[PDB]
Ligand binder design. Sequence first.
Ligand SMILES: c1ccc(Cn2c(-c3ccccc3)nc3ccccc32)cc1
Ligand SMILES: c1ccc(Cn2c(-c3ccccc3)nc3ccccc32)cc1
Length: 146
Amino acid sequence: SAKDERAREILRGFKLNWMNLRDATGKILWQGTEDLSVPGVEHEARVPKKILKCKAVSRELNFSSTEQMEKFRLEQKVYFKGQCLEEWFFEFGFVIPNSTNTWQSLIEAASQMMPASVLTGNVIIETKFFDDDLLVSTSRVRLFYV
Ligand SMILES: c1ccc(Cn2c(-c3ccccc3)nc3ccccc32)cc1
Ligand SMILES: c1ccc(Cn2c(-c3ccccc3)nc3ccccc32)cc1
């Protein structure tokens, strides 16, 4: 498949270099330099339990891409014991080939949050990276609230 080949070339040229998450306040709650978008392994992350109390979280994601993309975007779902509680869609748009870019996003809370003690180790955030219609990769991060 031609679309399969193109998806693989974009994955091959892509890297998430670093990311922060902030109370939308301004305070950095989490930051890391591990590429959490790599597919096929379950990533793990520890975040402060107080993040669950934010009405919104601001994310800064810095990424490199050898390939040009027409409409880079993400679909992300929070799963609790296998069940999707919440979904978000974000669009970055055009990506210049061989560029490194910082993408800021406002992630808004939906519903009432279970306690951190119940959620911890039982939440997966699944992130699907698209160029327009073309699915480039699916990755998963298991969350611990600490
Ligand atoms: C720590 C940072 C990010 C996540 C999940 N995640 C999020 C995210 C975090 C919280 C709510 C919504 C999405 N955006 C991502 C972009 C690329 C890769 C992973 C992403 C889990 C733990
Ligand atoms: C504000 C916006 C988004 C969130 C997303 N979120 C998060 C989360 C938020 C920020 C970083 C890591 C996880 N864990 C959740 C568990 C169940 C439902 C939603 C969850 C929290 C606060």
